[PDB]
Design a protein around this ligand. Structure first.
Ligand SMILES: *O[C@H]1[C@@H](O)[C@@H](CO)O[C@@H](O[C@H]2[C@H](O)[C@@H](O)[C@H](O)O[C@@H]2CO)[C@@H]1O
Length: 146
């Protein structure tokens, strides 16, 4: 892996070091703290806060009750239609590895070595230049393969 970021402070907002062409991997290794209610990994168009930057792909594990992963897109400061995956691998106090693979038509995401979900593109992935990680999460490394 390339352009590896170690132990970033959260919230993390960083420029992705190359375009997200088909076959690109984003690999994120981390841990969920015991007090976590949710965290998110956002692939964004820029880093503006006011107005809020468009989020092509919001990947949002939530830990209340049996948990879930909520995926969505933010356009013009407005959330679209949620795609919720209830078969969630994440747990409070457990370590994880997320692999986001960018394909022509969709994102393909594996967690802890097992296929987890697909998310069809809503914003062209060529519009993505920024990776954001927010919420209650401990990140050990972020790595890229272009
Ligand atoms: O932070 C926001 C983000 O996670 C979006 C993703 O769609 O969800 C927002 O919360 C939703 C919530 O998921 C839904 O159940 C409720 O009816 O609407 C909320 C506001 O859009 C998060 O605020």
């Amino acid at each position: 892996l390339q352009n590896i970021i170690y132990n970033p402070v959260i919230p993390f907002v960083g420029t992705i070091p190359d375009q997200l062409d088909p076959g690109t991997l984003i690999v994120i290794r981390g841990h969920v703290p015991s007090d976590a209610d949710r965290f998110q990994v956002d692939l964004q168009n820029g880093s503006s806060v006011k107005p809020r930057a468009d989020v092509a792909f919001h990947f949002n594990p939530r830990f209340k009750r049996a948990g879930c992963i909520v995926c969505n897109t933010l356009i013009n400061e407005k959330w679209g239609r949620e795609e919720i995956t209830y078969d969630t691998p994440f747990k409070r106090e457990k370590s994880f590895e997320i692999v986001i693979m960018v394909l022509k038509d969709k994102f393909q995401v594996a967690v802890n070595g097992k296929h987890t979900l697909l998310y069809g593109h809503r914003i062209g992935p060529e519009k993505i230049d920024t990776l954001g990680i927010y919420g209650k999460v401990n990140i050990h490394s972020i790595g890229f393969s272009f």
